[PDB]
Ligand binder design. Structure first.
Ligand SMILES: Nc1ncnc2c1ncn2[C@@H]1O[C@H](COP(=O)(O)OP(=O)(O)OP(=O)(O)O)[C@@H](O)[C@H]1O
Ligand SMILES: Nc1ncnc2c1ncn2[C@@H]1O[C@H](COP(=O)(O)OP(=O)(O)OP(=O)(O)O)[C@@H](O)[C@H]1O
Ligand SMILES: Nc1ncnc2c1ncn2[C@@H]1O[C@H](COP(=O)(O)OP(=O)(O)OP(=O)(O)O)[C@@H](O)[C@H]1O
Ligand SMILES: OC[C@H]1O[C@H](O[C@H]2[C@H](O)[C@@H](O)[C@@H](O)O[C@@H]2CO)[C@H](O)[C@@H](O)[C@@H]1O
Ligand SMILES: OC[C@H]1O[C@H](O[C@H]2[C@H](O)[C@@H](O)[C@@H](O)O[C@@H]2CO)[C@H](O)[C@@H](O)[C@@H]1O
Ligand SMILES: OC[C@H]1O[C@H](O[C@H]2[C@H](O)[C@@H](O)[C@@H](O)O[C@@H]2CO)[C@H](O)[C@@H](O)[C@@H]1O
Ligand SMILES: OC[C@H]1O[C@H](O[C@H]2[C@H](O)[C@@H](O)[C@@H](O)O[C@@H]2CO)[C@H](O)[C@@H](O)[C@@H]1O
Ligand SMILES: OC[C@H]1O[C@H](O[C@H]2[C@H](O)[C@@H](O)[C@@H](O)O[C@@H]2CO)[C@H](O)[C@@H](O)[C@@H]1O
Ligand SMILES: OC[C@H]1O[C@H](O[C@H]2[C@H](O)[C@@H](O)[C@@H](O)O[C@@H]2CO)[C@H](O)[C@@H](O)[C@@H]1O
Ligand SMILES: *[C@@H]1O[C@H](CO)[C@@H](O)[C@H](O)[C@H]1NC(C)=O
Ligand SMILES: *[C@@H]1O[C@H](CO)[C@@H](O)[C@H](O)[C@H]1NC(C)=O
Ligand SMILES: *[C@@H]1O[C@H](CO)[C@@H](O)[C@H](O)[C@H]1NC(C)=O
Ligand SMILES: *[C@@H]1O[C@H](CO)[C@@H](O)[C@H](O)[C@H]1NC(C)=O
Ligand SMILES: *[C@@H]1O[C@H](CO)[C@@H](O)[C@H](O)[C@H]1NC(C)=O
Ligand SMILES: *[C@@H]1O[C@H](CO)[C@@H](O)[C@H](O)[C@H]1NC(C)=O
Ligand SMILES: *[C@@H]1O[C@H](CO)[C@@H](O)[C@H](O)[C@H]1NC(C)=O
Ligand SMILES: *[C@@H]1O[C@H](CO)[C@@H](O)[C@H](O)[C@H]1NC(C)=O
Ligand SMILES: *[C@@H]1O[C@H](CO)[C@@H](O)[C@H](O)[C@H]1NC(C)=O
Ligand SMILES: *[C@@H]1O[C@H](CO)[C@@H](O)[C@H](O)[C@H]1NC(C)=O
Ligand SMILES: *[C@@H]1O[C@H](CO)[C@@H](O)[C@H](O)[C@H]1NC(C)=O
Ligand SMILES: *[C@@H]1O[C@H](CO)[C@@H](O)[C@H](O)[C@H]1NC(C)=O
Ligand SMILES: NC(=O)CN(CC(=O)O)CC(=O)O
Lengths: 357, 357, 357
């Protein structure tokens, strides 16, 4: 049945409620224009599924254990991904072989073979149950495994030179929704630039060479301590780009932080270290290995971003929401008009028609 | 033109439609108060961009191949990240050298040199085209590469002791929106605690030491089988925290599962294994290597979470949505009033004014 | 006070505005039925927190440096995760030892000891400050470190055979919201299938064997060049599944691309390479190593997806939004009726009641 309903309406002409209503409407409109559209950029589509690729390479040489250490000695793993370690401190145990020997840590002290049992399984290898002489002063439980066991009585030095190593970060990102590609290596970067650019998160965001010490400082850490305990530093690269502006306005934002925050607050586990071994065998069949306890700084490059570009659909939908919402003022203007205008009684009479039954 | 419109309204006074309308309104209000605000916590802002850091360390010793294996023998890779493997089974091929030799697998059986060609490229090295004697009973295609080739006729044992290794998980998380930091190592964790805490997802979520066997059990797996085939276990740590409550109420939730689910359902690929080599060279220039086929359990620690905290903006917006929505009952109350109240005719007459032209 | 308000309404009976109003309503309804419900599937819940597991294994043998290279020689790292490298080109420096020696790169050319200082820290080891003879024609700064240093005067060949290696991808995914599990290895995959299936993103998405050369081609790259410079290829596996259809309708979508896009656009850094060393020691205590500069293709398997399944809550909410929105046509029908129907004056008179004071 083709019939169109529309409500009968009172049309007050008082100047007060006119200005007040037009004012409330102007406030709604201004809120949508200023906050929903400008600040929150509701007029554009957003891409958050950013595709990122990170390739890294470290350079620098250091003196440690009276030997020169280069990238292949101190960076692990070696494949140049977004997570890698620069080893800044080591505890080395040369020429371990499978056999029997006493633990060196005082935590394994024994006077009699009775104390050597399941109560102290952690560390070294498997206990024999015997109690043996580590030195003339100390006696410890005998173990079968890699011998001799490691010793941690005196602290080893750090590789101070590591503060001066360089990290090359080649980062490529793409917002697929807009088919947009950019990286921190601009296409006009020259060999000279690589030789002389000085990275700074504000002054030069497109220099791909970062000094380790600078990264540690930006993260609010003291290299002397971090290199002693080890830790984890995050290099966050953010691509928040407004594709309505120029390609050259899309700029990476570098943040630096320490990620293993629980470590600084903990007396039981203060840094980051791990153990690995170099494996050898003699001309004879038998095997031997060097055990290494490495302390270092773990870097992981975390890439995030979102892009926005003007689109008609969201603009239409959002403006429709604006116009639909401009009406909401009628509840306020109604309270005011019907209850606080000294002419309220007349308006209440004209607006409401009571009914009974 | 400062003019304020408002609609003329009928004001029924029937008790039935009064109670029914106030009831529908109470139902809307109660739905918003109970579901939108309480259950869905629409009164608070949410942070989902959680920053997580995971450091791991394994401890334990085992007997395998009549040698003691420690962390550096059986964990790979070694850097203590959120993904690592404990090797529970091995197939070892000692002292391989570059040369010529016959394949040992029956899948390469040949009677004549004709059968040795491109049809069987997988495995070993490059075929010479010749057919040679592996043993007096079996003959196989000759290959050039690492010799001798590996053999898989009889199954090797697993490292049962691995069920007893321990995994140390130091996890640090931060919700940046609220500048909130916490980890599974509480600041009051003591050396005694580390020596004696018993991890349980409910009874002790802040014990950082997890027993491998316990992890395998929580994931509904049988260590005896998993260690034979290899597999992938996920340790999920969830931080779902209501920052309106106390910091100490923010607690990690551990889940355990097997991630390579396709493996249990497959007859062709049942677990997880990989090959690597230890490289050596003699006093002579020539090189030789030990080849290793490792079966093990891959652990990856997956950290997720979201935080919520009271904020005024979303509370205002949501309550505005509540009041705006309370009106929607008028369509129902209209159907009822106008069509099912026995006094309907009068109301239809008072409400509608027909027009023609 | 149990009172029910309802507005007094004009009820035009003109056929024109009847058809026009019913038409606008039909357009709103059709927009919701066609776009909000069908295309955008607003009638179902969505799971985006997909759980994915990837296990990889490479197979193939190649000839390089007149030796046969198998998986343990050219894949790194070895643990078969979703990111791995196939090494396609190498620069080998045999039997390095700690000592003194001259740089070989012309970039370190010196005539006098004065030029050997901090200005050229990158590369090799630590400068002694002396200027020494590399050859009768060239002189370079002496360094202390691993000797001899590497040389890059003539380009080494690539491992062409790598185009023919195979990548086994076992991918298991689970949408937890719907407790849905599936992988690219179907449970009915047979050894024959593994021996003979030919992967294609459209014709055979469930073949888990991918030929390296095919992956390089799908990513729009030339193996001859990529294997020379190195690079990063992404294998994206997308699980976009409508759980209202059959389990067997849930199919993976393979995409291939090159992720280090900045490399092709850059003259300073064109590919992907990294350095590592094989470590040895003689019967004597002293150590020596082989240094390797590896160029290769990095593959990382990126798994994404979202699942949707019918649910009552979102259907109710969305249909409620449809009916609520069907009214919005009244502003348009009002403009038309009140201003463009030649009978407008009568309607304006019936609808509006002016008031003054
Ligand atoms: N898997 C594990 N099982 C039991 N205890 C562990 C484990 N991993 C670490 N720990 C203990 O937790 C504490 C902190 O570990 P952390 O690695 O930070 O210090 P550490 O002195 O390097 O430990 P260690 O030298 O024994 O490897 C130490 O007492 C350490 O022995
Ligand atoms: N890259 C590849 N190319 C061809 N076939 C492969 C590849 N990777 C694995 N396969 C085959 O898929 C099947 C399952 O592989 P899986 O690694 O689970 O078992 P496997 O017995 O350890 O295989 P293998 O011992 O040959 O490495 C095996 O038949 C294996 O040969
Ligand atoms: N950590 C770093 N510090 C300084 N320069 C670097 C660093 N990493 C790479 N570079 C330089 O950036 C340029 C591009 O590096 P890339 O690795 O792509 O090429 P390359 O020729 O393999 O470099 P190299 O052979 O010196 O390792 C080269 O000139 C290289 O020396
Ligand atoms: O500037 C190039 C850009 O123009 C258009 O975008 C507008 C944008 O909407 C405005 O906010 C303004 O600040 O920037 C542009 C006007 O110069 C389109 O995005 C497109 O045509 C083009 O990329
Ligand atoms: O507004 C962006 C919009 O993009 C897509 O919508 C497309 C649709 O995919 C096409 O079929 C086309 O015909 O209509 C739309 C044109 O923009 C997404 O499907 C949609 O989710 C997204 O909002
Ligand atoms: O309790 C400390 C906390 O108080 C405030 O939060 C309220 C919260 O809104 C209530 O739901 C209640 O359950 O908890 C708190 C009242 O004790 C604020 O969040 C803030 O002042 C403070 O952190
Ligand atoms: O409601 C949370 C809100 O936080 C931010 O809004 C800020 C804004 O960034 C500031 O400029 C400030 O002046 O106004 C708001 C105060 O909360 C986010 O911009 C916004 O997206 C988010 O909703
Ligand atoms: O088909 C099995 C499936 O049926 C139901 O889903 C409907 C779906 O809503 C329709 O769009 C249609 O295309 O597919 C199904 C009708 O065959 C339920 O999802 C459930 O009972 C079952 O899984
Ligand atoms: O519509 C999906 C819905 O799922 C969950 O809602 C559940 C709720 O968790 C249960 O307590 C149950 O009693 O009520 C709902 C039944 O679907 C989520 O809580 C909610 O966020 C989600 O929308
Ligand atoms: C170690 O042996 C020495 C002599 O061999 C002697 O001092 C003592 O018996 C042992 N040490 C301890 C602490 O018992
Ligand atoms: C870092 O290098 C500069 C010269 O490039 C040198 O002056 C400084 O001492 C170095 N720092 C350390 C800790 O060696
Ligand atoms: C390289 O191009 C970018 C892109 O606009 C520009 O900002 C930069 O100034 C250019 N570099 C030089 C040295 O001109
Ligand atoms: C091999 O010879 C070394 C001495 O050079 C000896 O220490 C080792 O025990 C021998 N092992 C075997 C198995 O003969
Ligand atoms: C292997 O050689 C032996 C003797 O050298 C003999 O049995 C036979 O010729 C070969 N084996 C087969 C299966 O042909
Ligand atoms: C694990 O350790 C306990 C003692 O700590 C021992 O009783 C048990 O036999 C061990 N399990 C295995 C499989 O060795
Ligand atoms: C450590 O602090 C947390 C934080 O409230 C608390 O729950 C726990 O009981 C404390 N531990 C001890 C041993 O008091
Ligand atoms: C090196 O010597 C060993 C014997 O010790 C021999 O097997 C090998 O073939 C020799 N290789 C070369 C290149 O001389
Ligand atoms: C290298 O030494 C040779 C002779 O020892 C001689 O040609 C010259 O002094 C040196 N080369 C240069 C370029 O000076
Ligand atoms: C790849 O293998 C086929 C046979 O399987 C062979 O014809 C082709 O030459 C190989 N490609 C290369 C580059 O060796
Ligand atoms: C294996 O099962 C899937 C699931 O429906 C099916 O699509 C496929 O055709 C099956 N394979 C064979 C060989 O029947
Ligand atoms: C070890 O012996 C080799 C010769 O075989 C010699 O080159 C090296 O300098 C020696 N090193 C030491 C520390 O004796
Ligand atoms: N301002 C509102 O949310 C009122 N809405 C109606 C509603 O969703 O309840 C108008 C609309 O968006 O169509």
């Amino acid at each position: 049945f083709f019939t169109y309903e529309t409500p009968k309406v009172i049309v007050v002409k008082s100047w007060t409620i006119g200005i007040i209503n037009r004012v409330v409407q102007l406030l709604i409109i201004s809120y949508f224009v200023g906050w929903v559209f400008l600040h929150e950029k509701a007029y554009q589509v957003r891409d958050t599924a950013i595709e990122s690729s990170v390739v890294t390479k470290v350079k620098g040489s250091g003196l440690y254990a009276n030997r020169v250490m280069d990238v292949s000695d101190y960076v692990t793993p070696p494949q140049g991904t977004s997570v890698f370690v620069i080893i800044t401190k080591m505890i080395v145990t040369e020429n371990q072989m499978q056999g029997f020997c006493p633990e060196s840590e005082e935590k394994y002290r024994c006077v009699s073979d009775s104390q050597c049992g399941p109560e102290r399984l952690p560390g070294g290898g498997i206990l024999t149950g015997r109690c043996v002489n580590y030195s003339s002063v100390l006696r410890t439980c005998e173990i079968q495994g890699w011998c001799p066991t490691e010793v941690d009585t005196v602290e080893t030095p750090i590789m101070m030179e590591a503060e001066n190593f360089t990290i090359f970060i080649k980062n490529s990102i793409r917002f697929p929704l807009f088919n947009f590609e950019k990286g921190n290596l601009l296409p006009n970067l020259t060999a000279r630039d690589m030789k002389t650019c000085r990275f700074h998160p504000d002054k030069d965001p497109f220099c791909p060479i970062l000094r380790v010490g600078d990264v540690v400082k930006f993260a609010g850490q003291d290299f002397a301590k971090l290199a002693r305990t080890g830790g984890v530093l995050g290099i966050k690269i953010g691509w928040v780009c407004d594709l309505d502006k120029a390609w050259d306005q899309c700029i990476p934002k570098y943040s630096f932080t320490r990620l293993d925050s629980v470590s600084e607050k903990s007396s039981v586990s203060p840094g980051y270290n791990f153990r690995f071994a170099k494996y050898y065998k003699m001309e004879n069949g038998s095997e031997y290995r060097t055990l290494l306890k490495a302390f270092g700084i773990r870097f992981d490059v975390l890439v995030y971003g979102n892009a926005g570009k003007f689109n008609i659909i969201p603009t239409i939908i959002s403006s429709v929401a604006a116009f639909t919402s401009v009406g909401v003022g009628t509840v306020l203007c109604d309270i005011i008009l019907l209850n606080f205008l000294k002419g309220a009684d007349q308006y209440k009479a004209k607006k409401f028609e009571e009914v009974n039954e």
